[PDB]
């Protein structure tokens, strides 16, 4: 049971710190419990800004599930860092939306592997 | 049969909006039908600039074949976005060549999967 | 025997042109001889600067082993470019450490393939 995305994640679909699970088109991700952490087999690049409206670029390989509700049953994911030794997830930097060209950050077929207990 | 690149794509080989197919060293790519779209298993990073000579970086996962001519018999690829729902390809941002270090953007062994039709 | 990393490479562990082999948590990598070159199945993103105040990003797919000393017995890897035709390795750009968010550049499970002869 390898979990693969079935929908593309576009940069214009990111909120400041998360995105909706539904975008990835994966029932396993949609039903994953709160706090589940996944490692991606493809990098998730996140443009950020340290100030002055300037864009810089970060890379993340891990997503943490935030359980949904009636309006958004599939919930959300935050990108960040999974420490496999200490078993900790740390949220990544906020996404900065400016004038970047539209991009598929994670394409269809991205493999997601649960890494927490 | 899986199509793998046999030659590295270097950043200093990109034109503003394409690169020559021959660079990838793949006969299946060289003779792919005009307009064929491929998804990559590795990100293609394209440096761009929206102004002031400032470089930012975009990611692409899709290439569209442009048929050759007598001068370039194997033709070209453009990078861009494949919409697998609406079955459309949109060319990506222009590559901005300035003072970046030389880089292999796509190494030997990159897997290319046809996704159109 | 595919070689997979067992520890994450964090951006805050990079020196200007190398990092300690031991960080990747792999005995095969640790014992690899001076001069061994590996290709990665995942991009290694290296932030650099042109020197006017801004962080840009380069991509590398190759590492070369450099023999260590009493303080770092397993030695170091440098990122760079492997030319598979001419059998040459060229060191990549200096890493620029500024105020970037902490990032896993290469996660656990990155596959390293020896490519020098
Ligand atoms: Ca910047
Ligand atoms: Ca810049």
Numbering used by the authors:
A (entry chain A), B (entry chain B), C (entry chain C): 7 to 123
What did the original publication write about this model?
Here we report protein crystal structures of a piscine betanodavirus, the Grouper nervous necrosis virus (GNNV), in four different forms. The overall topological structure of the GNNV CP consists of the N-terminal arm (N-arm) (residues 34−51), the shell domain (S-domain) (residues 52−213), the linker region (residues 214−220) and the protrusion domain (P-domain) (residues 221−338). The S-domain comprises an eight-stranded anti-parallel β-sandwich with three short α-helices, which is a canonical structural feature similar to other virus CPs.
To gain more complete and detailed structural information, we have determined the crystal structure of the truncated P-domain (residues 214−338) at high resolution (1.2 Å). Since it lacks only the S-domain, crystal packing of the truncated P-domain remains a trimer in the ASU, with a similar orientation and formation as the P-domains in the GNNV-LP. 275 motif on the C’-D’ loop from each neighboring subunit interacts with two Ca2+ ions and two water molecules through electrostatic and hydrogen-bonding interactions. This calcium-binding site is buried in the cavity of the protrusion at a distance of ~37 Å from the S-domain. Notably, only two of the three Asp275 residues are asymmetrically coordinated to the two Ca2+ ions, and the other Asp275 coordinates with one water molecule. There are two water molecules at the calcium-binding site providing the trimeric contacts and stabilizing the protrusion. We consistently find three glycerol (GOL) molecules located between the B’-C’ and F’-G’ loops of the three P-domains, and one polyethylene glycol (PEG) molecule at the interface between the two F’-G’ loops from neighboring subunits. Our study identifies a PEG-binding site on the P-domain of GNNV CP and confirms the enhancement of GNNV infection in presence of PEG.
